[PDB]
């Protein structure tokens, strides 16, 4: 890639039956001990990226681009995977070094791999192309970067041995894989899900992949998320224990956890002790702390204001990898700008909370530690009843998940499964003496002996290796629909790779936001607002967002629309500055005197005096020396005093414009300089409410200065025009 | 209730605590563990033929006409070996002729 | 007022020589302790208030409105005060007790008072006229939200005395008053400026008022902010001691507290050791705690999460009040909808705090201790150095101030005032031994025992009382421009007061936001974006944000603009609800069953599962039992099981759409329920990709759900129609 | 530098350097509040005026004449108090009279 050309999706697309990924397994960030960034040293940074965008406010300090410790997710999915991986290019310069792809609704009921590169709803269809097409994307964007990124996905469903091999020979750096997910959120036949997910996990260990639980699901059918917290730590033990057994590394395995609550609730008090209630109970474990969506609406500001609190849980407590959550996501399909936000948002609070456990610690005796042992008892209780009841599938049955209430509290409305019902129930076969499985990494029984005592650690010699160890081995399949896939999809934008139009999230596809406020009552806003919309030619109007600042008084409204029009990049007429730094530079090194006044019979002296105190702006600010005569001052002695003083610049205020006495006293100051010598030698600046910069240069004074004027424009003109004069 | 159901809990240290919560785990999950060991699903059979050459859409044929003839017991990647060394064919081939409907009768032999 | 009209500022504007402020002096909040507010108990709230509007987050906790303890200020100053009122009802409503306005520029050297109501350029121009319009509608507001409300501006300048006099009669309730900002910032001069504040304050302490220093001027002129703490000490110190021995009581003496960084310096870090230093020092003074501004840019996001690490800080230490920055204050001159994010972001992060020093403390030995004695010894040092140099005029004109050195590091530039200069330099005049002034209040040297010995405590007593004792004296002045004032503004948009358009600060202003990305880079897409918003009428378009995604893929542009057109109200078509908790309630008091298949051939099952589900939202999270059974299900096999279970509804899915067949299968379904004769008693919803609602009725069943069917929907339908049929 | 400006507060406890802190920054503006008892600005006497229930108008215009007149020692609220007794008149007659120009002969003697 090139910093300033656009990625060639068209390109990265040939060949993907050639592909193979350059790496395998997740990747964790370097800590950079004491690391120093322009004028800061961090404490808990790591290694910095090669290539990145710096927050805006970063011009400050030299445009300094720090990098927190956990490893950073942004969700891209939009149904159209080769969109996506644009985004994935602007995620990762602003710092995502995890991307994780939400599949197309309901994947997890497809019986095996689909093919190709069919259009997705409310997510990416996972398929071996469309994988190799973004983990290539990836590979380029990861090099331009700097740093490695994880590419992660979903092994859920009844088909989670078929996807864990496909990942594995792809080269996906983690996925998502908890059983229990499978039975109580899809209904998957639990005997079915339990007996699929060792194969599962076996492989996802083969491939050195981190896997992230499903525990978060939990908070999202909570009636009360804050009730919910000793499900939460069953489930994350389950998931933990089973997948360490399988054979997996502790280190790889990552509890999702999300705070339960938000504002108006006290979360952080509500949250923290089961925050540090489970990292106790999980030391060794990874945690992956995810942003929250139970509780969020429609509002941008809202929404960052709870995930900054969400990141100073994880700073309190520990996060290996921290999730984020976009801005915009209880308002709309996510859209590029508000990826960036949140890994913006994300990179920013963490950073600004850099040393923040060198300076501040948990009372861990006290409320807090009355709450965490509390919350343990509650969880070891909930372990006695699953046993009582005469284990795990005893305890879903009776309907011990997904209840309302706070354990051991049970309103008895939970989800039961059935250990004979749910998809694929009847689908299991005890292996005969004599099974067999020719490959690596397979969990159970496997009879190897029967054909050779030398092969049972390495069954796949007898094949001579299996798609694990001989990649030439793996069938690539393009696509099966002729009509659904990427190729006729970017047939029908080509016209867009000198046209130009706004998108949110495909290309072209016009959308834009629009926010206003409207004096008048909600739900009248709200319909004003459509009309003012279409008034502006945007189709496909949709308020998706409504806050009142009071009843009767106003309301703000915001919109999206469709700009159903096209421009030309050739039309636009595209016309072709010193810093404050450079002006001050300037001045320290040749010292710059100036006389000012009020000239006349002008009494108004705020104008001249804004543009050279301090306070806003003024050449002051510049180290500009001024001999300030005052108001009403006659202009022969204005004249006068900067001959007297040696003055290099006289600088005037006309304020009064009657009978354009304000150009008469400006011709008048150029007139009497000239009549006394020095016009040559000195720089007039006249200023005033109705001075047009124009007129005043034809009064024959070198600048003109009217509405608005600072300091900064003034101290400009100083320093260029005595270069100039030079 | 939540302070009756407690009572025995409330002498144990933390670490005895963690260790009972973790233990307790471990009995609940060992059996699911052992379905695992001792069992086998479409998926894991189709995922076995996925890692010995065979495409999904090759996988899902073979594994339908397996269940059909009540063979799962003997895992189908074991059954495309042993008819691929029992004809002297290559893996693919006696996969490819399975999925089609041939060799079954063989293999019930 | 009535909560659904608007404020009548034409009838507030009436009679204003005939008001009297209701109450006098400063407020703070009412501590609640242990406060029950939903489910929820608060550590650190006050008591709530009689009318608001809750966070958007709050309709998932019965829309409580907790408030915190500090006092919240907002800044609102648009140079049309009419406006601005209606503005203070806003904000009053989203929690603000502190409404501060700041002055039209530079009416520190206005030597007097003005009068009437002029229009202002940056500020409100303030005078008497002015503060009794809006003290008078802060009245009316703050018995409408049920709490008062504090009125606060600028004593500053070189009339303080007139102004404080002005403040202290009309029930101004605080005001920033500081001689060391007239000296540094506006060049007033040094003996002039400290001899009027002694009055000034004498003024403002006999009217019971808060005072809030100059310190966070210091921040902003800094080069760098994190080296000017060791000043900002002395600053308050110096002011803080000044106002205590005048008479001002400690408790009314705040100083204004801005934390000195922003990400991506590691900031709270640099912060907290300065924060908990000055809390130390000035243990027993108020603390005002003020956002940042010097490192802000024309990101809202940025601001907003910059703005939650500076709520941090105050609640790690400690903010008497806790003052606001609207997000937008680095884009653009304040929004109506800005100052409302800004009220609830500073409620929404203190609420999440909530509690949080009961879990959390600062680890003050160790890093942090060393650093706080640290800054400790530089202020003392300073203060050493001032005396040795002879005092606090010496130390001005030695340049001590405004140098951008880390002290004692002094780098030399400085700002020096000359002790007989600035503005005001020799107006300083000797009190004679019969001096004499006869009113309350009054600083100075003062002999009334000429006159009367009985006298000297109440010297108003010689004239029967001064305007602080007999309000009757005061000499009301209207409007001495007549063509420059509110009414002249007010019959401008008479017309507004059924047309209606968007404004952001003035009556009809028609100004609107855009936020658009367009696939280009930054210079490109800022003229492209403005040409977009010329095609969608917008007028006087302006680029007022914009970042970079990446240099080559995009940029996200935001601009404003304004509408040319209105809308009549009248001209509107307005068309003229059940909750979750309805419907899972009724299914809980009465049991809803029913029988679900993919019907005819089709095997796609996943979207008949999508709205079952509860992963996203099926109808299983509200309680209904499901029989699936599963897919190619023949439509009679789905009636005969329908009847044979004994369910009140069938759901069946069609998927392919191939020749009808989804339509077609639904009308077998509705002969066949009909055949069977039971139509009447089973509820029958059909649902399918290529389904349309009003196509599906027409085939005699019940309900059609299409693409983006929810849960919801399909609940809402089953009890819905349930009822119906009863 | 800072190393060596410190030394002589190194061995103070936190209760010594802050009382110290203190008691310099009271040293600091004790002249400053000297200043105020002992001197007047027109600003301060308008105030006068203002509480004595003159408007700012007429307040500027008396403290104009008062300093043209070389009698800002006396107060311009005393001149308008002193005028206000020896005329027998109200002290708001007294000042819009001053104000407008009368009685400085008077005021002066
Ligand atoms: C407040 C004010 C006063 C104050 C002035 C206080 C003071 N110390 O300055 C008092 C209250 C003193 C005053 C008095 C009068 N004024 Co008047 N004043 C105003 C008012 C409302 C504000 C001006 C202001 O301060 N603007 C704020 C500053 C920041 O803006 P600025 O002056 O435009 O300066 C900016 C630019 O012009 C530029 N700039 C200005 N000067 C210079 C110089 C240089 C070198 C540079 C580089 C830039 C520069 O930079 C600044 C941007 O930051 C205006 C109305 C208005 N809205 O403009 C009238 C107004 C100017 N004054 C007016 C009048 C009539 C009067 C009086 C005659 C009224 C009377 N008494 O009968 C008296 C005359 C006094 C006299 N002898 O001169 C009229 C003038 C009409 C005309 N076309 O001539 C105005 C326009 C009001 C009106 N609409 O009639 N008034
Ligand atoms: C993935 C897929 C498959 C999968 C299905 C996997 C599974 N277990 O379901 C497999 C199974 C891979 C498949 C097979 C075939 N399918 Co196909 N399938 C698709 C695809 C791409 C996804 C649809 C999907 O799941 N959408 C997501 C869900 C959530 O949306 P939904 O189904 O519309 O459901 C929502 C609403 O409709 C509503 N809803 C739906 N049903 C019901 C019922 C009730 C009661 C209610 C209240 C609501 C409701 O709520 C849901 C959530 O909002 C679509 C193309 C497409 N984009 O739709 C075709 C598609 C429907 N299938 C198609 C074809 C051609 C086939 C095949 C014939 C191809 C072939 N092999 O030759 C085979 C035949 C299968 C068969 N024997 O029936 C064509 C249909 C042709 C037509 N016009 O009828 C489609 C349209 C693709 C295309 N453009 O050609 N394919
Ligand atoms: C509806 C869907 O079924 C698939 N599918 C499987 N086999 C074929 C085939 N031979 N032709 C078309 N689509 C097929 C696709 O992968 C598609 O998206
Ligand atoms: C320019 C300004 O001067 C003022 N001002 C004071 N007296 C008068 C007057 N007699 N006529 C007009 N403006 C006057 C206003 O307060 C105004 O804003
Ligand atoms: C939300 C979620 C999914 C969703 O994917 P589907 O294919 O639609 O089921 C999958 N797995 C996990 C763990 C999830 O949390
Ligand atoms: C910013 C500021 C002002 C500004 O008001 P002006 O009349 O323009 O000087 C005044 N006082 C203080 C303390 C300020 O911080």
Redesign the interface.
Same mark, same amino acid.
């Given at each position: 890639l090139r910093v300033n050309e656009k990625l060639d999706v068209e390109n990265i697309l040939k060949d993907l039956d050639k592909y193979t990924p350059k790496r395998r397994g997740w990747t964790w960030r370097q800590p950079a001990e004491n690391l120093q960034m322009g004028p800061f040293i961090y404490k808990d940074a790591s290694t910095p990226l090669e290539n990145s965008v710096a927050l805006p406010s970063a011009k400050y300090f030299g445009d300094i681009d720090p990098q927190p410790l956990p490893v950073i997710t942004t969700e891209i999915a939009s149904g159209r995977f080769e969109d996506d991986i644009r985004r994935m290019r602007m995620a990762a310069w602003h710092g995502a070094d995890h991307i994780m792809v939400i599949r197309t609704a309901g994947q997890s009921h497809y019986d095996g791999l689909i093919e190709g590169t069919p259009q997705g709803i409310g997510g990416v269809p996972i398929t071996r192309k469309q994988v190799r097409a973004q983990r290539k994307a990836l590979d380029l964007i990861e090099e331009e970067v700097g740093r490695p990124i994880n590419y992660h996905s979903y092994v859920s469903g009844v088909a989670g041995p078929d996807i864990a091999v496909m990942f594995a020979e792809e080269g996906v750096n983690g996925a998502h894989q908890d059983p229990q997910y499978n039975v109580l959120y899809r209904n998957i036949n639990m005997i079915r899900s339990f007996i699929d997910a060792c194969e599962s996990k076996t492989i996802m260990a083969w491939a050195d992949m981190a896997q992230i639980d499903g525990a978060h699901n939990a908070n999202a059918t909570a009636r009360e998320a804050w009730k919910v917290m000793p499900e939460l730590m069953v489930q994350h033990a389950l998931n933990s224990i089973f997948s360490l057994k399988v054979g997996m590394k502790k280190s790889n395995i990552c509890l999702s956890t999300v705070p339960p609550t938000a504002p108006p609730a006290p979360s952080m008090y509500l949250d923290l002790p089961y925050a540090v209630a489970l990292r106790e109970m999980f030391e060794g474990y990874r945690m992956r702390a995810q942003m929250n969506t139970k509780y969020m609406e429609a509002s941008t500001r809202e929404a960052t204001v709870t995930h900054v609190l969400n990141l100073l849980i994880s700073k309190l407590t520990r996060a290996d990898i921290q999730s984020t959550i976009t801005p915009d996501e209880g308002r709309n399909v996510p859209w590029h700008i508000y990826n960036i936000e949140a890994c913006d948002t994300a990179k920013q609070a963490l950073i600004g909370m850099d040393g923040l456990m060198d300076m501040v610690q948990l009372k861990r005796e006290g409320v807090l530690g009355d709450t965490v042992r509390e919350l343990k008892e509650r969880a070891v209780l909930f372990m006695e009843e699953i046993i009582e009841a005469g284990g795990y599938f005893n305890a879903v049955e009776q309907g011990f998940f997904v209840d309302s209430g706070y354990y051991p509290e049970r309103n008895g409305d939970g989800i039961a499964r059935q250990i004979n019902g749910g998809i694929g129930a009847g689908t299991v076969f005890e292996r005969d003496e004599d099974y067999m499985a020719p490959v690596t990494a397979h969990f159970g029984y496997n009879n190897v002996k029967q054909y050779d005592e030398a092969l049972v650690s390495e069954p796949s010699k007898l094949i001579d290796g299996c798609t694990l160890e001989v990649p030439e081995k793996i069938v690539y399949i393009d696509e099966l629909d002729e009509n659904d896939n990427v190729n006729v999809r970017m047939e029908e934008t080509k016209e867009f790779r000198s046209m130009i139009k706004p998108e949110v999230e495909w290309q072209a596809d016009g959308t834009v936001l629009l926010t206003m406020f409207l004096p008048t009552s909600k739900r009248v806003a709200e319909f004003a607002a459509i009309e003012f919309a279409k008034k502006m030619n945007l189709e496909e109007v949709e308020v998706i967002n409504r806050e009142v600042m009071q009843e009767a008084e106003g309301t703000r409204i915001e919109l999206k629309g469709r700009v159903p029009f096209s421009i030309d990049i050739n039309s636009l007429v595209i016309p072709p500055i010193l810093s404050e730094d450079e002006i001050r530079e300037d001045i320290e090194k040749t010292p710059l005197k100036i006389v000012a006044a009020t000239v006349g019979e002008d009494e108004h002296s705020v104008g001249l005096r804004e543009v050279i105190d301090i306070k806003h702006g003024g050449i002051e600010k510049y180290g500009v020396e001024v001999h300030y005569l005052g108001t009403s001052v006659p202009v022969e002695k204005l004249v006068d005093a900067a001959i007297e003083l040696k003055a290099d610049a006289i600088l005037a205020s006309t304020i009064i414009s009657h009978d354009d006495i304000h150009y008469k006293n400006m011709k008048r100051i150029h007139e009497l300089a000239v009549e006394k010598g020095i016009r040559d030698k000195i720089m007039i600046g006249c200023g005033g409410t109705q001075v047009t910069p124009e007129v005043a240069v034809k009064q024959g004074v070198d600048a003109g200065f009217g509405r608005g004027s600072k300091g900064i424009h003034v101290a400009t003109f100083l320093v260029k025009k005595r270069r100039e004069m030079r | 209730?939540?302070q009756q159901?407690?009572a025995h809990?409330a002498n144990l240290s933390?670490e005895e605590?963690?260790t !009972?919560?973790?233990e $307790?785990?471990? #009995?609940?999950?060992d059996?699911?563990?052992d379905? =695992? #060991?001792?069992? *086998? *699903?479409? @998926?894991?059979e !189709? @995922?076995?033929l996925?890692?010995?050459?065979? +495409? +999904?859409?090759?996988? #899902?044929a073979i594994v339908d006409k397996t269940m059909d003839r009540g063979l $799962? =017991? #003997?895992?189908a =990647?074991?059954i495309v070996?042993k008819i691929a060394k029992e004809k002297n064919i290559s893996?693919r081939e006696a996969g490819l002729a399975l999925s089609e409907g041939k060799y079954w009768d063989d293999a019930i032999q």
């Open positions: - | 209730d939540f159901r407690r809990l933390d605590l963690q !009972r919560f973790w $307790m785990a471990e #009995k609940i999950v059996p699911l563990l379905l =695992g #060991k001792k069992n *086998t *699903t479409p @998926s894991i !189709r @995922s076995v996925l890692r010995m050459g065979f +495409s +999904s859409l090759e996988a #899902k $799962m =017991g #003997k895992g =990647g074991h070996y893996v």
